[PDB]
Subunit: 114 residues, 3 copies
């Protein structure tokens, strides 16, 4: 006595009378806490994770960046707007700011009589 | 010789002498592996997760996209700049590249003579 | 009793005959479920997480936004395109839409 342990319905491993079982974490992403006074074990996910990828339906975040299926991609090579409009853009003020359509139309109306 | 098991201080049950306990993963997001050679069970977070949402204070990543609270968002429908400028934009040269303000100013300038 | 329980090979205690062991989660981010009176326990990551940060090599997601090392960032201050082109922009039609180079060239040609 002697109880049987299974994991994911694998085979019995006996934990015998006077025997032992060790529970361990594979990485810093999973915390397992126990002390020497009580049997109690607490498991948790780290609040700062290190991951290879995350899938959220058509949204993927990975080591290269953010990808949305049939949508934008954001990587170290830059922003791909996904063949979609970019909306909510404040007017550009510096040479290296994006311009919005209101700015383009102002210059169009000027150039036609300037 | 039995022993009593609770999970989150609940669902109290006896694991009797000769009885059995299974520990399983609810999904691919959490890996659990037994090594019966040394009576160890290792637990870890998968490095590739499938999730519904992540909240980091005002930042949300979910199945629709990336959201900054009251600010920019990136979804399949496109990028919303949040009524802020888009900075650090290089000059467009292909049809679907964004235009920066320096390009608009160059065209405004070149039509002085013409 | 009894059998010996360690975590990461440390903190041994004896789960004695007639003793008790509790397995609990430390936060809402980890789900541990016992199947009632059944001796099976399931562990999983919550599908909705609350985190401080995630690092994926040079990509960081945190409470400020999304950052790519040597690349763009997206925060409450706005989007920085990383001193690089923005590609794949559909033509703007409303006042606050971005405009693409084809639109700029169209107006250059018209004059």
């Amino acid at each position: 006595g002697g109880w049987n342990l299974t994991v994911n319905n694998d085979n019995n491993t006996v934990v015998s009378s006077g025997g032992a079982l060790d529970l361990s974490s594979g990485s810093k992403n999973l915390k397992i806490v126990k002390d020497g006074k009580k049997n109690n074990v607490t498991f948790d996910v780290a609040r700062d994770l290190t991951l290879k990828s995350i899938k959220l339906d058509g949204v993927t975040l990975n080591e290269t960046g953010l990808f949305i299926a049939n949508g934008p991609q954001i990587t170290a090579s830059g922003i791909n707007a996904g063949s979609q409009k970019i909306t909510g853009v404040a007017e550009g003020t510096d040479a290296n700011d994006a311009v919005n359509f209101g700015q383009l139309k102002k210059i169009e109306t000027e150039v036609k009589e300037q």
